[PDB]
């Protein structure tokens, strides 16, 4: 009751702070200047403003007893604000998720940008009515002096329009990165036992066809794979047509070389973005898992509208939005704990000490 905006006081702080700290991290560090970063900023700025503009005001119905206490045309403008900011969030981690996989099927600032306006105006979209009909009748917005969206058919609609299409994208795009990067895996240790069992062919060889064979079946396995080492490849493989046995064996080990050098550069690539995968996962598993409540519950005040206890529904609702608020603090403790760059720029940050 009274005591119980305490809480909600620290809340808002470490909102305000850890998102701070992320937009600075991705505005200072070069090390962050990619789009999966831009879209994390964006995200940011959007978990800022929840903290700044919402969540203050949620802390002071909760002081008034629910009922409102600001003017009257300030109750849909804050109901506004609240789903634009829960809206971008979702649309921001589709936009990742749909981005990344589209960057694996594949070979700037501004592209990245362009995107997240894209999202943001999407996300004004869609949350248009809020205002503009609930600024017209208080009946959408107001529910016994207590602000609050009323209207039944802007939560359902919202709901699956706003919420079930980004989430229903960003979990088949999440899939299918996993199994796009495991494929990928798979190809390659494919592509290392060929190199490798004809390596071995080579260096046992006796004659010119059974070199001049196994580098052939090297500069296909080469063409899967990718540059640099298919000419080095011709480079031997003229010395192999010409019978010059011992010669292309000499350089076969040669390429051994060059072999092992785009093998572990491919192989950590995949071990980064497998990492990078797993990071944004968690961010994606913690905004449902923590809004899945309020979600819920929230569609069931509709549903069994006077079969079940309006004010235990909504003494949940208080509570439960609070769980998804909470979401806003936890995004920059997951690049803390899973991420170095922004561990590092954190650590100097707090000690007031910006240059990379
Ligand atoms: O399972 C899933 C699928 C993925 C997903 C995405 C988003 C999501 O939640 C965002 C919805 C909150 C937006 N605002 C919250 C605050 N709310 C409000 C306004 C006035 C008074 C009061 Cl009391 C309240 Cl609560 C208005 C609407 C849940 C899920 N869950
Ligand atoms: C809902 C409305 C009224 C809230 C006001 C929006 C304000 C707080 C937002 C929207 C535009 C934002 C800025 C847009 C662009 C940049 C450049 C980037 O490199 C660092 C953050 C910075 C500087 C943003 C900071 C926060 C910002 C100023
Ligand atoms: C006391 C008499 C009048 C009957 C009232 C029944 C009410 C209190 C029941 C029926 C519908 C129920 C809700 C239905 C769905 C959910 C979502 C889930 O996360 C569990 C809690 C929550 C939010 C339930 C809480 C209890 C609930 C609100
Ligand atoms: C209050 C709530 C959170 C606070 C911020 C938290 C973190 C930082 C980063 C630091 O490097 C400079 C101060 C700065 C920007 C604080 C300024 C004051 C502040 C806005
Ligand atoms: C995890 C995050 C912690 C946040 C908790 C805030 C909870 C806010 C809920 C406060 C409920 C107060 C209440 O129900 O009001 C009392 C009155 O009797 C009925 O109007
Ligand atoms: C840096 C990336 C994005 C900055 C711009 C995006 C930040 C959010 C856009 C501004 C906004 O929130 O505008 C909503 C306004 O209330 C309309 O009525
Ligand atoms: C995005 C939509 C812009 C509308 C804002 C209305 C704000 C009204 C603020 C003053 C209210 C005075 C009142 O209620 O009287
Ligand atoms: C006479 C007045 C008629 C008024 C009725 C017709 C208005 C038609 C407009 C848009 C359809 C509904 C828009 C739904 C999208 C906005 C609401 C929203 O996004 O709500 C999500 C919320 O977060 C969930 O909890
Ligand atoms: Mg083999």
Redesign the pocket.
């Known amino acids: 009751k009274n005591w119980s905006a305490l809480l909600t006081a620290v809340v808002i702080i470490l909102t305000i702070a850890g998102n701070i700290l992320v937009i600075m991290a991705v505005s200072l560090e070069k090390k962050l200047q990619n789009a999966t970063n831009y879209f994390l900023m964006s995200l940011a700025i959007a978990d800022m403003l929840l903290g700044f503009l919402v969540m203050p005001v949620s802390m002071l119905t909760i002081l008034y007893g629910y009922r409102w206490p600001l003017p009257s045309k300030l109750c849909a403008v804050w109901i506004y604000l ?2 634009l900011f ?2 971008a969030k979702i649309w921001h981690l589709c936009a990742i998720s749909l981005d990344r996989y589209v960057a694996i099927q594949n070979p700037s600032r501004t592209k990245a940008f362009l995107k997240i306006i894209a999202v943001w105006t999407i996300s004004v979209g ?5 205002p ?2 609930g600024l ?2 208080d009946s ?1 917005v107001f529910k016994e002096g207590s602000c609050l ?1 009323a ?1 039944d ?7 699956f ?3 079930f299409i980004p989430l229903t994208i960003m979990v088949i795009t999440y899939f299918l990165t996993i199994k796009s990067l495991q494929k990928e895996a798979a190809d390659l240790e494919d592509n290392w036992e060929t190199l490798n069992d004809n390596l071995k062919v080579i260096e046992k060889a006796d004659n010119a066809a059974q070199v001049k064979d196994a580098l052939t079946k090297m500069r296909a396995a080469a063409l899967d794979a990718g540059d640099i080492l298919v000419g080095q490849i011709d480079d031997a493989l003229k010395l192999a047509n010409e019978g010059k046995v011992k010669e292309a064996q000499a350089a076969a080990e040669q390429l051994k070389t060059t072999i092992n050098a785009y093998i572990q550069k491919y192989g950590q690539s995949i071990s980064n973005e497998q990492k990078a995968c797993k990071v944004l996962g968690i961010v994606f598993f913690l905004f449902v898992v923590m809004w899945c409540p ?2 819920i519950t ?1 569609i069931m005040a509709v549903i069994c509208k006077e079969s079940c206890n309006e004010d235990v529904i909504g003494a949940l609702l208080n509570v439960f939005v609070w769980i998804g608020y909470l979401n806003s603090a936890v995004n920059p403790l997951v690049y803390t704990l899973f991420n170095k760059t922004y561990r590092s720029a954190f650590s100097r940050y707090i000690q007031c000490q910006y240059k990379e």
């Not at 869609?126 to 809020?130: A, H, L, R, Y």
């Not at 058919?153 to 709901?159: D, H, K, M, R, T």
């Open positions: 609240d789903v829960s809206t869609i949350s248009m009515p809020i503009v009909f017209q009748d959408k969206l209207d058919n802007f939560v359902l609609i919202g709901s329009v706003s919420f309020f979600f929230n």
